[PDB]
Amino acid sequence: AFVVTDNCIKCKYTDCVEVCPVDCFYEGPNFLVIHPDECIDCASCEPECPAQAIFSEDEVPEDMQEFIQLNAELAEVWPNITEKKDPLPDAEDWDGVKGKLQHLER
Ligand code: SF4
Ligand code: F3S
């Protein structure tokens, strides 16, 4: 499984969804997650994230491990996002801001 991590929160560029062969991306208000059962590990999405927040499950950073499970949980309750849309309003300022987990919107 591929995993979206902390830097996607309040960027949510959604460039990732256009390259996914199986539409395994689920949409939160200020975040996107990858359904772990549906993701087929092609990694087409990982270069496409400006946030560089997508990671192969085995290479998700030691301090962002919570996100594996979070992708799994939220992918069960969030609607499917298949089309690219415009980034969140102040996305490039928030990009690179650490610890945005505190601000994740359900
Ligand atoms: S690795 Fe491939 S299948 Fe998995 S979420 Fe990314 S684009 Fe979709
Ligand atoms: S910012 Fe998030 S919305 Fe997609 S392009 Fe990167 S994983």
| Residue ranges making up the domain that contains 37 | 1-106
Distance from the alpha carbon of residue 34 to the mean position of ligand 1, in angstroms:
7
Q: Which two tokens stand for residue 71?
A: 């992708």
Answer yes or no: is the C-beta of 32 below 6 A from any ligand 2 atom: yes
CB proximity list for 22: less than 8 A, separation 6 or greater: 38, 39, 40
Experimental method: X-ray
Measured CA to CA, the distance from residue 94 to residue 97 in angstroms comes to 5
Binding residues: 8, 16, 20, 39, 42, 45, 49
CATH number at residue 60: 3.30.70.20
Resolution limit, Å: 2.2
- Token pair in block for residue 43: 């990694």
How far apart are alpha carbons 4 and 67 in whole angstroms? Answer: 7
Structurally, the chain folds into a number of domains equal to: 1
| Three-class secondary structure of residue 13 per DSSP | coil
Angstrom distances, CA of residue 9 to CA of 40, 41, 42: 23, 22, 23
- Side chain identity at residue 3, one-letter code: V
